[model samples]
Target: SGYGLPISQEVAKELAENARKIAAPGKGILAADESTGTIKKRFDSIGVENTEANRAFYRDLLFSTKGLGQYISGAILFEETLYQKSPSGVPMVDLLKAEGIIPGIKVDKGLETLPLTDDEKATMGLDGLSERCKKYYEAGARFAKWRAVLSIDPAKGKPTNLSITEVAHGLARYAAICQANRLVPIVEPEILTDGSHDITVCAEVTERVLAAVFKALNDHHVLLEGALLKPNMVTHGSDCPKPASHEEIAFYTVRSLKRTVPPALPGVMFLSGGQSEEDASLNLNEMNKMGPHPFQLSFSYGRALQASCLKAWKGVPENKAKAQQVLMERARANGEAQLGKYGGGAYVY
Candidate 1:
């Protein structure tokens, strides 16, 4: 028998449908959910001030891009962006809806260091998550995201068992809350790649983390069909002397998912996790080329999708069109990659 919860069958069915739509073939998600401080860093890189109006303007550029819905099925937004409006006073959520893009929200407050752990961090914001989800749903959000960050440092006994259990429980609880309010939860347990580990080590850690996450979700009675997963692809650590090929990365990544993730889940959208824009697409393309997986292999990318666009826009009105063009092209390439058809090297940005 399967684990059952208090969620109604009707609500569960709706959740499954929305999850499928968000992970529809040839489309993925745009993770425009950077917190205020985080977006400030992005703006600062381009020498632009990080004001409320500027944040609204920048997100407006992303949300209002023509034809974006064809490639982007959903967009994850920050709390501020969820309630923001365009320069001309159009609601942000309305803009996304106009393009047929489903609006989502980032629900986690952020990270805080776990006590008695080797500096491992846990995601917060569960205190009022149910209330927040209600408001987000009322504001046009159909899904939610919570990121749990873990690090790899074998020498320091990093990602201690305690840390893993804490993160898994937190994510499970968050997912349950989101579902209660009719939002599909995107469960993200990101194992940081900031180490000198090899590909095998990374794969080992990923498998273990995912296994724990699913177990907790089951324990918490989270409806698997109503959720999506956002995980880092298996890859060599950033400081590894020898990097693995895209083929190797795809093999490990898919194998890990097969071992741990249930097919009941509608999507397995990957996080970019510091991969370059081109590398991210190529790796995803390689995974798709490998043929049939349990769930849709897609993306929920931030920097990978917006890095070039930010440089192109530069806060100048004259550059908005070019910037939107750049964004669409990146979206197109990633969309092609989602279906294993990206030819690569066509765009040099």
Candidate 2:
């Protein structure tokens, strides 16, 4: 119901109300761009070698993080490190809007291996993804992302419907084309960790893939408060033979996202599903250190925030200030797991 161009629906309702007002009431978000094939498979799981100007000289040292937006409110870009610059060309969204932060992009162009789940894989970028989300919101990129790889097929027992409608219509057509090109559409789908499924069958297949992604974002008319879900914290799939604790992974991840997330969705952002950045910051600092969170636990971790700051900035300039102090110690341990206050983010270098 737009194209009337009222300033692109008021800049997609001010980028989803400024990303739920910087992840409201405790703030979070610091995913640190990681796609050179997932930082070359976390630098070949330690043997490091996936070069491209040595992975842009260690992702230009965590986007040259200097204060990293004082506990980072946002920073998720990745398409070749979002229009790269920062050495001095600036433009990493003006180096994270000069630290006030907020800049996201990763308009899916990943996942493809799906011969009917021989170890599953589906997320394929929506054919020319709405013209690359209007060329990443004209390069400054208010927000964007597409992810959609559902999983679970240990020798094929279930998971089909062409891998859950190929990640629920690829996250409902990438949230109806990033809210019709005004941007602000994180809308991930995840659901993998090479399953063993059993947090009650990963909460009944993440509530039937989020009720078929809000009914295909209400049949492609999408506008769910400008959008942002980034899910997959339901737990139990990293080869689960039984290993969940910390109060049963914080009461089955807030009762499976309050039985399939829909508190008029504004924020969720939890994909450290491949946990181990201190067990994904102590499972999001013990679910915001346990209080009240059916949503808003925050994170988008790529190897849990640069797997040890890309091996302490291995494209080193003498370990660029200890890889920007371990990328602000993994963005202050996920900003203290967005306030459940996690400190176990171990440090020593």
Candidate 3:
């Protein structure tokens, strides 16, 4: 129905099939894609030293959890994890594949400030992304992720037009490149909730940001069927005094997505975006319950999926089983959320 791009029909079909598998019903993506420095902060909180062995061990624990694939359809891994092997001499990707989980890779280098803007930033790493994607695909990565961060302050006129356009174009280019390399792209345009704005303000900004992103995607001729969206659930800013209910958030979030996201996209997997574990699950459940929308409503969570598990593990060998159990429980809760069946309450770890 649109102009043909350079990608062949076979590659396009493969991308679409992989995207659908990753966004399969009652399952979601595990965002284990934290960069070295980012994981350091997570490690610092638990007093675990950030060594290569320790990093590998921690990831091994997450991947080796039995029955994880029952709820997790895919896992997004950092570059190191993508290439590393389990302590048992098995490739990390193989472990996930054994459990029926599709392996994905994070491709963005990081973020850089847009010049002359009030701390507005753009994601880098496009320089050699094509070559990197080809390597990742050869190593068993079926999908790729790039996170473009935007912030909202209302004051200082944050997330200026330049920032939004740059992020949108960056994401579109990244998606096109990934599809060309036979990897489905997870286009994440995260609007940071670090401000004093109310939910309505957040709704407005999210709508505008997503509108620009879709436009850029269309302009770049990105195959929507071959891509997934990892977006923030519209909500009150962190510092906002008035908090929104799960139903309220679900209402506005779905409304915004319906307005901007194209139906051709397979899923709208939500980033937890600092929501507490229960809040994330409940909000997602609410969205699912309210759905009958154009795309699958699911999760692509990081902290919300692993916080309690990390706390349980605390780098202790004896706690490995306990930590895995916690991870599975959280995954199950989120899985239920995807089907609109999450029982409301704080999940017992």
Candidate 4:
């Protein structure tokens, strides 16, 4: 698991190509990869039962949304969603393909708290990742995702050195294994913004974490050009009384990434973390306006992209069309944000 030759050059080249397409300019990823348990809350709000039929239907609505591919370059699927078929008998993967969106699979099995640090956790699912990657590719997944969670709480004096190192090693190892199996890996080291930290603290933590992350990637011989990064943009924690302007957040986030991430990485697809839907779009729009980065600044959003769609659907089959329309609207907003031209108009669910 230490230094050695990476995967074959042929595989490396293919991986980089896949990464480029997914990180294409004026586009971002639709992170519909919420685990079954995680998505239940979304379903519960609408009084929908958490059945496979319901889950499949919900995903069917999102993937089947007309013209979503214009804004979304990729769709990340949970394991069940990845293998499930649409009602018309088409594989979910093939459905996304028809929309011009590349399909990706979420490979991590969630996280467990570190032995002594409740605030930091290591990602799982690396046990048989090689075989999974091989099978996923054959089944129509061109890329894969893994996540390691870390947190910063100034009051708790958290995110200790041990936590940072473990997360970096875990994410880097996951990336290398995915590349070796011919899948472009989305390396997600998401530091949660749940505390009362200010924007400056968030920026400092981000740079520190990312610097350690790329070093571990190098140690494991993971090809930077073959991977994408899913990270949280720098901003004040939700509990902070002071709000960070979109421009302020953009400047700090881009500054942190530039200091740590290499130019070879295709892009940084931001996680919404807990930012409100509109805030996420505005912040991303600001980042693009800031301009001239080493890599594209985009999004790999979950709730930020789906909240309105879910509200529209409300578990009604007849609402499918309306849900899809809502999805396109959100995607259009984000797509425009990718272009730095979003006008911040009022959008109704």
Candidate 5:
């Protein structure tokens, strides 16, 4: 057979159920899955050391934020964090479960430069993924996320066939294996906005790229209903001469998803994709307001969701609750944004 056996119905049902739960109305995902090195950069910004203790404290602060479960339905955990415990020796998984939030894990091992492309790369870490997924599931993760990054370059004529094909193949393979291991996969194909392209180009490229991804998934027999797509919203490149309004971004992004993404998928979660905290919230708010699309409109944000919270904490023990309050603020804002009810009169980034 060209494709392998389809996943058992029981497994598919479980995966779909989890996907729906995580994408429930007014709920989104908190992406606290930054690697140690990535978290180190965030820590250094606030003049904090990147010690194990410091990392644990930071994650604890975010995870234990009061009322987080009201907005954040799921959290994607880094490998180190998936097994870490809280100050009271409780497993991080148990803490999230107690709060009615799902625990997910990032399974990809960062991107590596593709052999023959001009600065394009594929996500690595599929060498022993089945084993890793099993271990992560046993340790208490119900979902897995893998990021495949593509870039746009005017000179390089970016996201060539090499880039798109590699991303689709890798993401589809990851999805197939994840379902076999009882983990729902969040497939991320991010088109980096580092060029001088306009919103039209962004929309065109996104539609083409996502279409390729879905084709590969079908080829691999991945269960669409059990999967979630985490995609970048259509917007002008950061370096573009013109800026795109939230209204334009929403219209183009939703149209592209409607064109390429199948209705069978349970959700379509937007990645902040380098937008500032405020822009991310406002853009999502616009999308939800314009929605009624086939899949749920939500978010899976890392930096955008935690920028202020990190500043509030600054690694100070006394400021934990305050930091949590800041975290809750962002989560709550995004939650409302997802429901198209964002009260945008006043807010801080």
Candidate 6:
């Protein structure tokens, strides 16, 4: 599928309006869900205890923040955590809505290992996913996330086409399904940075993935007004030498996004990939500060959001207040970073 009739004038007007609703000014997302397995490994990395209750406590620390949604428009949650109660036994959705943040849930049941393509990509959970999505919507999820992974790793040289299409098809299917249920879909196409490639390679792969996705959105007739994009920031691979400057990263990234992403879509909240906390915030700030672009440049971060705060927490009971202080600092810094006003003392996170 190619482009449509340039969108009807009336429909175009509405698309622009809805884009503004999500991408307005400098808003972003607060990513609070790291599945129990994700958290367990994070705890293992720091030699701390990992348990269900403690995991809940950690997420509670972030969500329970007094004025979090002051700068955040929404929150992404895992299924288990979404239906759980807070320390005060208040419903999580109520807490988020109290501050005007839309509550969203992660919809896909994690990608299962597929049989072919040398394991370079993954197919997601869509069988019976629609029924599960309705249940999540009933549980107060205004949006949902369905992730599909791809890689740019070169074994002896060439990347595989089958790997790419399988992922593209999977993401398109998930997006269309989510939309038919009236749930805002965050279409994330990730190129894992587990190898040694240059920024151009990263940008090229990102552009290809996004192009396929936009075409899929067209084919499926997904309401662009109601969808958000979650993409990996364009940067060289994790093991690549000659790390890029913020300016270089910004230039390549904006150019790639403009070429592939449509103006009709809402915001583009980036995954930090594997950038350190500071680098993620700094690069995002650079995008907002300099980009005269169409959609919003914001964050949908995981490790970058919680790494520093987790360090401060250290699973120490005596340091609960200190942990909260760091969590607030990171959240506040990212919120300000959304505006490119970040500087000086706000660097602690």
Give the alpha carbon lDDT tens digit for every residue of 278-339 in model 4. 99999999988978778988999999999888999999999999999988988888888887
- In candidate 6, how many clashes are counted? 0
Question: Each candidate's TM vs. the true structure?
Answer: 0.97, 0.33, 0.97, 0.96, 0.97, 0.89
- The local lDDT score (0 to 100) that residue 72 gets in candidate 6 is 69
Better of 5 and 6 by TM-score: 5
- Which candidate has the highest lDDT of all? 3
Model 2: how far residue 321 lies from native, Å: 12
Q: Write model 6 residue lDDT over 12-56, tens digit each, in one string.
A: 454345434545555677777677787788888767777767777
The runs of at least 3 residues in candidate 4 whose Cα sits more than 4 Å from the true structure, single-residue gaps closed, are 1-3, 347-349
Go through the candidates in order and give each one's C-alpha lDDT: 0.93, 0.72, 0.93, 0.89, 0.91, 0.75
- Model 2 Cα lDDT, one tens digit per residue, 1-349: 6542333667667766876865665556666566776667777866768866566656666766788777777778787767776555555677678777778888787787778456566787788888888888888777777777777663565466677777777787887777777777877877776756676677677777777777777667676677778777767777877767655665676676766666767777787866777777777778776666645767767677777776776555687888789878877877777777876745000
Model 6 Cα displacement at 289 (Å)? 1.9
Q: Give the clash count for model 4.
A: 0
C-alpha lDDT (0 to 100) for residue 100 of candidate 6: 73
Candidate 5 deviant stretches above 4 angstroms: 1-4, 345-349
Least lDDT summed over 10 consecutive residues: which range in candidate 2? Answer: 1-10
**How would the candidate models be sorted by lDDT, starting from the highest?**
3, 1, 5, 4, 6, 2
* Worst 10-residue lDDT window, candidate 6: 11-20
Predicted structure 1: lDDT: 0.93
Candidate 5 lDDT over 233-286, as tens digits, reads: 999999977679898988898889998988999898899988988889999999
Q: What C-alpha lDDT, on a 0 to 100 scale, does residue 32 get in candidate 3?
A: 97
TM-score of 4: 0.96
Q: Distance from true position, residue 65, model 6, in Å?
A: 0.6
